[PDB]
Ligand SMILES: N=C(N)c1ccc2cc(C(=O)Nc3ccccc3)cc(Nc3ncccn3)c2c1
Ligand SMILES: N=C(N)c1ccc2cc(C(=O)Nc3ccccc3)cc(Nc3ncccn3)c2c1
């Protein structure tokens with residue numbers, strides 16, 4: 005996250021850090037708890053991941069320093085990537101992780117509500133342990149930044165070489181300065197409406213990070229609520 | 239219906255009583271007229287029904303005592319159950335009855351409008367001839383009860399062993415006392431908005447009837463308007 | 473267009489005139505620029521069209537007199553008709569034309585935004601070079617008429633022999649007098665909302681033109697945004 009600040013412990017209890025253990029353990033992406041056995045994240049996080057055996061999901065984390073070899077984690081039983089996904093910039097950048105065990109909800113870890121088709125937001129935040137600038141490194145403390153949504157027409161003007169579809173949502177300041185970046189991929193764009201937090205977007209792509217006239221692009225979660233229901237069925 | 243009152247004759251002209259003639263004739267479920275040849279109802283009503291030949295639809299009824307062997311009815315040519323339906327509690331609880339003859343609309347019998355995707359309600363009523371308590375019997379006079387809708391987040395808290403999906407809608411009072419019950423299955427949850435009645439829900443399931451902190455669960459009809467259009471085509 | 477007035481040059485820069493060259497060149501239908509290589513129009517325009525080789529799309533036109541044998545046009549590489557389309561009156565009346573070359577946007581020719589599912593209008597206009605009455609001829613100057621939308625319930629009362637679905641939108645005055653007509657087929661029903669023009673409808677059918685109690689029927693474009701995205705993908 006560029007231009008953000010440190011989060012308060014437990015203020016984004018749906019946020020997870022997804023690690024890979026290959027070659028050595030490191031944070032790979034963000035994600036969101038949406039159900040007792042389910043994390044919603046970005047499909048592009050799984051480039052080159054041939055097996056879910058190398059993944060670990062950590063919930064209830066503020067600082068990456070909390071994660072040691074003796075820290076509990078959730079194993080991943082299955083990676084479900086949208087069957088129309090090819091690459092972040094062409095959309096469908098959404099994936100589910102089915103966990104091996106169920107999350108026990110607590111003040112530190114609980115699910116975020118999915119947006120309602122009926123709500124198709126002025127208090128939106130992007131969170132993560134990603135870079136603070138394009139060439140940087142993973143941050144210890146979960147960062148947060150408040151960013152305004154921009155219309156799809158506005159976003160399209162900023163990305164003339166792309167097709168900004170109704171299955172994408174954009175957020176950014178005209179002058180830049182606050183945005184998601186590498187490593188924030190897969191995490192939430194969370195919006196508070198009528199005192200309830202909604203998972204409105206999934207961090208997906210953008211040209212650089214926090215540049216002027218280059219909003220962040222996110223998967224528009226409401227366009228996938230039918231897909232999420234279909235894929236999370238027994 | 240628990241905690242309801244007798245309806246005025248003709249005030250719910252889309253409501254039908256669906257009877258089975260097997261082994262002897264009795265009310266089986268409610269339904270709603272949505273087209274000249276079409277009744278919308280719940281799929282769970284058809285457990286063990288192997289043929290539409292045993293069904294009779296009666297329109298324009300207030301009291302079951304109006305139904306005698308000499309009373310006119312509509313035969314059922316076809317039962318169309320949603321192909322994803324398995325059981326009420328897992329959703330897709332929706333079915334169409336294609337009638338053998340067409341309904342001639344009148345002050346006693348006319349169709350209810352389907353909800354618009356654009357309207358994704360404070361004046362909602364559930365109606366039927368079902369039980370007044372869990373272990374009871376079919377009622378003579380069509381009953382009505384005004385019940386507030388509850389959010390899907392609220393409903394989910396009341397049914398922790400279920401998945402309350404966006405394809406379901408819930409309605410009930412926190413203290414209970416008014417609800418649908420056995421025998422109301424398949425009937426409408428009708429909401430009046432901008433002076434027009436909309437078929438918002440279909441009576442589907444609930445734990446007990448009218449219990450405290452146990453809202454009634456209904457099929458969210460707006461999530462099926464595309465299915466209804468597809469299935470009612472020639 | 474019945475009861476309209478001449479347009480100002482460039483005030484509907486998404487409007488195109490689609491011509492056929494067979495047997496001799498003439499205006500066939502209207503359409504709307506929605507992308508650099510894409511025109512959205514009505515499927516019924518292509519009755520008897522066996523090849524896209526006979527089509528020519530002209531952009532930036534006010535008067536048909538501007539079109540001469542030396543006027544530039546866009547060739548059509550492919551006609552994509554909705555696979556559920558059979559006839560205008562039963563819906564799915566939508567088609568895409570993939571152009572052979574891309575449109576270079578200018579003050580005279582630019583795309584209209586598609587409606588958002590979130591916007592599911594009081595300033596709606598229908599435009600075209602069609603007839604001014606049922607038995608007439610193509611008009612030289614692009615005509616415009618402001619027409620109010622009517623609800624689908626109201627529209628259904630006016631077309632009792634048809635099924636007015638949620639995939640259709642109607643517009644008209646109770647007393648008639650302003651409407652689209654033959655030759656306006658395929659053109660836009662454009663609505664201005666929050667200072668942005670949205671392509672809300674595609675001119676499709678109606679009984680006569682501008683008759684009392686016979687609104688114009690249009691394809692409800694918002695119900696096709698997923699189809700448009702699917703079909704315009706590489
Ligand atoms: N500005 C953003 N909102 C954003 C969000 C996520 C990103 C993820 C990657 C990303 O997935 N990075 C990546 C992953 C694997 C391998 C290589 C790069 C790359 C980004 N942008 C970028 N721009 C220019 C050059 C490099 N990166 C993002 C911007
Ligand atoms: N409270 C409700 N809104 C509701 C609505 C419909 C129902 C239909 C059946 C239903 O379909 N009953 C049934 C049908 C066939 C065979 C056996 C039972 C059963 C219900 N609840 C219930 N709860 C506990 C024990 C028994 N029933 C309902 C509640």
Ligand SMILES: N=C(N)c1ccc2cc(C(=O)Nc3ccccc3)cc(Nc3ncccn3)c2c1
Nearest residue numbers: 651652653654676677678679680681682688689
């Ligand atoms: N009133 C309208 N909004 C409307 C719009 C488009 C139409 C297109 C055709 C149309 O597609 N005409 C056509 C095309 C090819 C062959 C024959 C007729 C026919 C119409 N109406 C009509 N009504 C009665 C008798 C004839 N036409 C329309 C009304």
